[PDB]
């Protein structure tokens, strides 16, 4: 098997970096420009290295609010997994340091913007266009599941577009190395798996559930389960009934039924062949899986670029002051970071 030697060689490089362990650089060496995104624990800005001149995407996390919400386990897993993995569809990490008040991570800047901002403007992507992006998630999940890793957060808000129209997966805040089961509640309400809501101890099969919700939102323009209150969305997820649009192809409908199967016995990705069932499907018939990994397939849509450092493909936000105190905030907790 060709991919078996690939996943065996990839599991040797990942575990070598997994035990290689901090404070690569410092905040004084960056020029903050504009904010690219915001979250509950911090924001993501566009920074330029004052000396090297390269533009980067600095992710800031407040050390006090993370401790106040018991997110130290998820914080250490985001940094420990990012710098260890190596895949063309995963975002790259450069510098990781910390000061008195905030944790900092410096990633590869992806100026093409989110898939959310591009999907919401067009309305919906065509099935060949959707098959192009859906094929990259298959090879990415295949690589991550071989390392006993789970993502638990697949949504257009965490999928970026590079200079060649390919996907750059970011936001590893919910990544975790799990062999067996895990019992942590996390994800996106419109993308949560049924067993995650039922507190049933889920495995790597929840990433395949979010894959079906992702393809449905790209080909239609809305998730199959959505409403005002999150309790209304949960009533649709655990129900197991899905209403498909009319413009869907029947091969797309059948693949979504096998992926959105609330029954773990008949859900794709978690069977005998596993990921092989998704590649040999009638939908991914003309898909060149090797050329997708080699980035040789032509991109159907490439975003507009004004050079490195162009925040045109990112929505505007309100700028604030980066608050860095003089006192060390929870220094004993963030030591392995």
């Amino acid at each position: 098997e060709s991919v078996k030697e690939f996943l065996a060689k990839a599991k040797e490089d990942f575990l070598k970096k997994w035990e290689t362990p901090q404070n690569t650089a410092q905040l004084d060496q960056f020029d903050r420009i504009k904010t690219l995104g915001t979250g509950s624990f911090g924001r993501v800005m566009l920074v330029k290295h004052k000396e090297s001149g390269n533009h980067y995407a600095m992710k800031i996390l407040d050390k006090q609010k993370v401790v106040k919400l018991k997110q130290i386990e998820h914080t250490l897993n985001e940094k420990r997994i990012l710098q260890a993995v190596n895949f063309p569809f995963l975002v790259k990490l450069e510098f990781s340091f910390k000061d008195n008040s905030n944790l900092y991570m410096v990633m590869e800047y992806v100026a093409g913007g989110e898939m959310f901002s591009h999907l919401r403007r067009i309305g919906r992507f065509s099935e060949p266009h959707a098959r192009f992006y859906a094929a990259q998630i298959v090879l990415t999940f295949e690589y991550l599941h071989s390392l006993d890793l789970i993502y638990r957060d697949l949504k257009p808000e965490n999928l970026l577009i590079d200079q060649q129209g390919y996907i750059q997966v970011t936001d590893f805040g919910f990544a975790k190395r799990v062999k067996g089961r895990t019992w942590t509640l996390c994800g996106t309400p419109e993308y949560l798996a049924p067993e995650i809501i039922l507190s049933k101890g889920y495995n790597k099969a929840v990433d395949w559930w979010a894959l079906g919700v992702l393809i449905y939102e790209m080909a239609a323009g809305y998730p199959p389960f959505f409403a005002d209150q999150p309790i209304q969305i949960y009533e649709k997820i655990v129900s197991g009934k899905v209403r498909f649009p009319s413009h869907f192809s029947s091969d797309l409908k059948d693949l979504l039924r096998n992926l959105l199967q609330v029954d773990l016995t008949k859900r794709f990705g978690n069977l005998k062949n596993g990921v092989n069932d998704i590649k040999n499907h009638k939908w991914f018939a003309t898909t060149d899986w090797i050329a997708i990994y080699q980035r040789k397939v032509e991109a159907p849509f490439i975003p507009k670029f004004k050079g490195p450092g162009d925040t045109s493909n990112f929505d505007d936000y309100e700028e604030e002051e980066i608050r860095v105190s003089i006192n060390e905030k929870c220094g004993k907790e963030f030591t392995e970071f």
């Binding site: 979250g39 919400l69 018991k70 997110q71 919401r120 509640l185 996390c186």
Partner: peptide, 12 residues
């Protein structure tokens, strides 16, 4: 017009 509201992640 289009109000592109981004979805956040739920914890706890």
């Amino acid at each position: 017009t289009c109000s592109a509201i981004r979805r956040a992640s739920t914890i706890e």
